[PDB]
């Protein structure tokens, strides 16, 4: 990650204020509402027929927390994202067959969910670094594909 100490530092401080059970739940949901075609990988969760269903389905809410808690691991391994997410890359590629493009969609929704929580606090300089970051976690997950 070509991340700056002033950057890294903004990413970190804002993260320490994040309710991960909420945000993770909220990010995964919208992914499934705004990019409905991603529902392809989560058929075994239940009804994903409506906005309120998706946000309501706890299998969603739960997978969301798992996902965000791992983003959380990567946010203290910023100088070596690749190594952190290797096992995860191979997994999503060898077993789950997920098209890395979905990773990017998750970032952008992510960034979006975050502007919404911290409102004013989610300044442009802060967004820029997360942008930098969520692309990093993407390439990290995409890099062992074959």
């Amino acid at each position: 990650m070509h991340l700056t100490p002033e950057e890294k530092s903004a990413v970190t401080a804002l993260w320490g204020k994040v309710n991960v059970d909420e945000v993770g739940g909220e990010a995964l949901g919208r992914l499934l509402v705004v990019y409905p075609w991603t529902q392809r990988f989560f058929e075994s969760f239940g009804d994903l027929s409506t906005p309120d269903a998706v946000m309501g389905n706890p299998k969603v809410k739960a997978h969301g927390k798992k996902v965000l808690g791992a983003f959380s691991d990567g946010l203290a391994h910023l100088d070596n994202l690749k190594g952190t997410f290797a096992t995860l890359s191979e997994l999503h590629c060898d077993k789950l067959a997920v098209d890395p493009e979905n990773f990017r969609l998750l970032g952008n929704v992510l960034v979006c969910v975050l502007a919404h929580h911290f409102g004013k606090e989610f300044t442009p300089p802060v967004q820029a670094a997360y942008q930098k970051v969520v692309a990093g976690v993407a390439n990290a997950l995409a890099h062992k594909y074959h």
Binding site: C112, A115, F118, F122
Partner: peptide, 16 residues
Amino acid sequence: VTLAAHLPAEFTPAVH
């Protein structure tokens, strides 16, 4: 992103 940071209530997953 902008709209969300400014309109916390209108920004449902549906409006999104």
